[PDB]
Design a protein around this nucleic acid. Structure first.
Lengths: 176, 129, 67, 140, 116
RNA sequence: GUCGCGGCGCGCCGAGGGCCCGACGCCUGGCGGAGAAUCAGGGUUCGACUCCGGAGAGCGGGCCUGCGAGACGGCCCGCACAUCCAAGGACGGCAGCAGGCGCGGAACUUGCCCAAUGCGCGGCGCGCGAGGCAGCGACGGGGAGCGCGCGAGCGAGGCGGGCCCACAGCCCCCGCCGCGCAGCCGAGGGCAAGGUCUGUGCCAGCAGCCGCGGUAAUUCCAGCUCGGCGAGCGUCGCGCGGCGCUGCUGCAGUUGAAACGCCCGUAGUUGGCCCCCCGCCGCCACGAGGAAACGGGAGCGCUCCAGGCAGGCCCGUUGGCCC
């Protein structure tokens, strides 16, 4: 009754068992300053998924090389990480997946890919620009700063076709 | 009286190795002890074992090469799913690479590695590393 | 008359003087707050590091913030 | 002790656990059902109540103070609770026989701190939380 | 630009129609309405009768507009009148809308008529 | 007798049937499983509600109709507790949906429609408080904000559209107008953050715990600073982990809690070796068959996501496969 009940949801963010550790806390502030993260919840989502992917590689470790399940899952797990551009394309092995750190997940951010493209020359300005949707991924305007661009779309990401740089109309201060 | 004979003998073998004695006399002898000793001799943790046959239970004289850390019995002889034999090794044996859990299978008494090689579960006689 | 009890209800809360809040500007709530806390510690290393870091609330570190 | 370990001794192992699992005071409190029947807050986070009287309790030594408290009769079980009103001077906010919500001190039915005999403490008075009254966020 | 190429065309002999996916690649400002888009839709459909074409479901995507809609184009207007959900046909004026009761009013009258 | 087997009812004839491998009796703030929570492994805990199967429609009975109900939005009666009333009589049943009340710490609109999703009725469309849709809605889950720039620029909003929709709406897309907008616990430790000024003086208070306060409080009442989390933060109850402090893995008993004072003993449990070669065991592997959701997982850009099984110029497009 009410298929709204049938819709599901998941916990994507994991809090530290030890809440107050001064060395870990300060490092999280560095990550938050360097990658322009909003709150430590932001970091938790990335930390959780790094853990699960590495855990999947460890589950595959206890399987024999080329096991029907090991080969099928192994191909897919490696494929998604280099498909997103997170893991070294050439390695494609479980051991290389084990070394991945949340910095890779932070690098996939659309707001991160802008500071490398020199569009906003500031993670905090990239965040600001994405909020005004002045950056478009290949014909898709994005208001969300964690688009997680797949490797191919780095060429596509550019200033939006809507008024901004090379403007469609009047943007911002010229408009106002 | 003696309900487990393997355990009593293996404890003696470990006790002799502690005081650095090569030759041990095991007072009770059994086919399971015989097979357990044969597997250890193959893996070279023990040397030649000579059974002095008597008109009773039999005694075994075992020459030790000084290369066994520890042996043991699992009582009762549990039933192990072939899939979960790894869990038994992870806890009882140190390191996946070194150490032998000795099993019994309808095919025969066999090594945990051999049990994995044909994926057949069984009962654990004991363990040696 | 040391116990006081129900007759001493209130007491130090009622006796206390009221010192006013000093008017302050808002903080940059947002990732910006994380950005500015980072510029307080890891970037600059002057506000906390008098030669070496002294801790966020050290008395020497105060007054260098005008406090 | 051999801890009965035979392949056919699985009723003995089960029996021993069920009988000796009752020795633990915490498992006993949790699964005996004695707490549920005897709890003034029986399986409830909190309960409504009238203040029997406003009486301070002298604190256990070394600490020396009269911690103002209110005796409270519960609507649900008609049992009398001694509830410590918290913060400073908050007893004044309460009047005798006012509506009061009371929650446990946080030690799960055990007394917290120097207050003697205080399994619970006052959270709200006549619809207004005592902190809200204390901070003046919401007045009486 | 009204780039309505029209995809996933399916002729339905049963309903005497040819329903089809529709994509409008318009940059910047919104496409100017469903009915104006319909004139181009008929040309791409090649049905050649303006009345039997109608698009159910239009959504403009976030940022760039690549709206996907499903135009029902029929061989005959009378096939459209025999087989069209009344509410959509009410919106297009093909059929008029005899306004009903409150559904509750039908229930209240039903209860009294049952009482007879 | 029943649709039918049966102590299922009846006569008759015997003397059984159960049990320390716990019967019977009693109790249960006992629906059961699919599942859920927590988590190395093993465990533990919970099964109101989605799916399934049961069981009931205030409480007992008893019934006809029917293909099927011991039906309660059928009837009949006993028992409560009601309502209409002209006092003669009549007539009940929200463990349907809103809504009232009682109670409890605790829980939504007397809201709108059959158009899907089904079903009822018959080839030509209506019925459905099933269901959908909106309202309330910090149960909770997820995505963005409160800036940034030297002056760059929105979205939150507003106003008309487009479109959506049973109609509304909301989203999104357009043009214009453009109002960024934070808290809640703490700093003696555990446990992150003041060898600052006020008050107070074992008082008031604080403090899960150890502790602070007795006139110079790092612990209170304030100011100031600073910390942690974050549109959430605190508080209380409970489950799990912690806790190998329940111990199968895996606990202890000389002295911290704990070998019965001693011995025989029935059940129970445990039983040296020894026969290769089959027979039944147990045991282990391998099948077969038995719903999904769910957990995992392939494939996939909901603008990102929590999602969903979609999508795309297509495996016979997919939605495998495991549980």
């Amino acid at each position: 009754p009410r298929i709204s009940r049938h819709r599901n949801s998941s916990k994507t963010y994991s809090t530290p068992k030890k809440p107050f550790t001064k060395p870990r806390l300060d490092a999280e502030l560095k990550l938050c300053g360097e990658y322009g993260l909003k709150c430590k919840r932001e970091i938790y989502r990335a930390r959780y998924m790094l853990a699960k992917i590495r855990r999947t590689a460890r589950n595959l470790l206890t399987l024999d090389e080329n096991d029907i399940k090991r080969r099928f899952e192994g191909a897919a797990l490696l494929r998604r990480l280099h498909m997103l551009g997170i893991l070294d394309e050439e390695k494609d092995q479980l051991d290389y997946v084990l070394g991945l750190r949340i910095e890779d997940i932070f690098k996939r951010r659309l707001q991160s890919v802008i500071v490398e493209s020199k569009l906003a020359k500031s993670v905090h300005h990239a965040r600001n620009m994405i909020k005004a949707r002045h950056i478009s991924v290949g014909g898709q305007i994005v208001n969300i700063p964690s688009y997680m661009v797949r490797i191919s779309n780095t060429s596509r990401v550019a200033i939006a076709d809507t008024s901004s740089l090379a403007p469609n109309g009047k943007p911002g201060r010229t408009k106002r | 009286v003696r309900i487990n004979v393997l355990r009593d003998a293996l404890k003696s073998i470990c006790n002799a190795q502690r005081i650095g004695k090569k030759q041990v006399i095991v007072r009770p002898s059994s086919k399971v002890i015989i097979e357990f000793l044969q597997l250890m001799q193959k893996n070279g943790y023990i040397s030649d074992f000579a059974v002095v046959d008597n008109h009773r239970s039999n005694r075994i004289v075992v020459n030790l090469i000084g290369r066994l850390n520890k042996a043991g019995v699992i009582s009762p002889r549990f039933d192990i799913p072939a899939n979960d034999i790894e869990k038994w090794v992870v806890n009882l044996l140190p390191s996946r690479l070194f150490g032998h859990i000795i099993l019994t299978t309808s095919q025969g008494i066999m090594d945990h590695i051999e049990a994995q090689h044909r994926q057949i579960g069984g009962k654990v006689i004991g363990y040696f590393y | 008359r040391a116990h006081g009890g129900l007759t001493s209800a209130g007491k130090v809360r009622k006796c206390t003087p009221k010192k006013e809040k000093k008017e302050k500007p808002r903080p940059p709530r947002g990732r910006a707050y994380k950005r500015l806390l980072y510029n307080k510690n890891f970037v600059d290393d002057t506000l906390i590091h008098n030669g070496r870091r002294l801790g966020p609330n050290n008395l020497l570190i105060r007054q260098k913030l005008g406090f | 002790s051999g801890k009965t370990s035979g392949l056919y001794t699985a009723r003995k192992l089960r029996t021993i656990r069920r009988i000796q699992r009752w020795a633990d005071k915490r498992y006993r409190k949790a699964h005996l059902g004695t707490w549920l029947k005897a709890n003034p807050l029986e399986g409830a986070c909190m309960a409504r109540g009238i203040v029997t009287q406003k009486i301070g309790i002298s604190a256990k030594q070394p600490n020396s103070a009269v911690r103002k408290a209110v005796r409270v009769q519960l609507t649900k079980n008609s049992k009398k609770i001694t509830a410590f009103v918290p913060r400073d001077g908050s007893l004044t906010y309460i009047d005798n026989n006012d509506e009061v919500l009371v929650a446990g001190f946080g030690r799960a039915g055990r007394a917290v701190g120097d207050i003697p005999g205080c399994r619970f403490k006052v959270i709200k008075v006549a619809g207004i939380g005592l902190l809200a009254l204390f901070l003046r966020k919401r007045e009486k | 630009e009204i780039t309505v190429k029209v995809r996933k065309v399916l002729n339905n002999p049963l309903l005497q129609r040819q329903q089809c996916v529709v994509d409008v690649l318009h940059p910047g400002c919104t496409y100017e309405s469903k009915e104006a888009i319909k004139a181009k839709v008929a040309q791409q459909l090649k049905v050649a009768d303006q009345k039997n074409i109608v698009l159910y479901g239009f959504k403009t995507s976030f940022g760039g507009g690549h709206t996907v809609g499903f135009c029902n184009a029929y061989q005959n207007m009378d096939a459209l009148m025999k087989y069209e959900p009344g509410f959509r046909k009410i919106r297009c004026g093909l059929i008029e809308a005899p306004k009903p009761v409150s559904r509750k009013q039908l229930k209240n009258l039903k209860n009294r008529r049952l009482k007879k």
